[PDB]
């Protein structure tokens, strides 16, 4: 919880609400769902999506 | 993984059982599509986790 960054770039599966990113790229998570996924919004793109804490770590 | 799903219309869980209540417009992220009609989900705004019927849901996006 707070904000966290992604730590390698990610290409969503195509045909799930899973968010593309870039290294970098700033999230603000909203939930945090079973399994590490996480619900947020990607402050560069502003899109809301599914991503996982594997790709990403604490600011 | 997987896809966001939202309510078309309210719900109220029988009580002591694993289904959860909703109101419409509520968003859910889905984990498992259960050949019965139902599923288990997350509902995005309560955080309850639980079954809900894919009659009272539509797609999003």
Redesign the interface.
């Known amino acids: 919880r707070r904000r966290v960054r992604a730590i390698l770039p990610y290409t969503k ?1 195509p ?4 968010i593309s990113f870039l290294k970098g790229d700033m999230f603000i998570v ?2 945090e ?2 399994d590490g ?1 996480m ?1 947020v919004t990607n402050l560069r793109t502003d899109e809301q999506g ?1 991503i ?1 804490e594997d790709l990403v770590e604490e600011v």
């Open positions: 599966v045909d799930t609400d899973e909203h939930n769902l079973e996924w619900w599914l996982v």
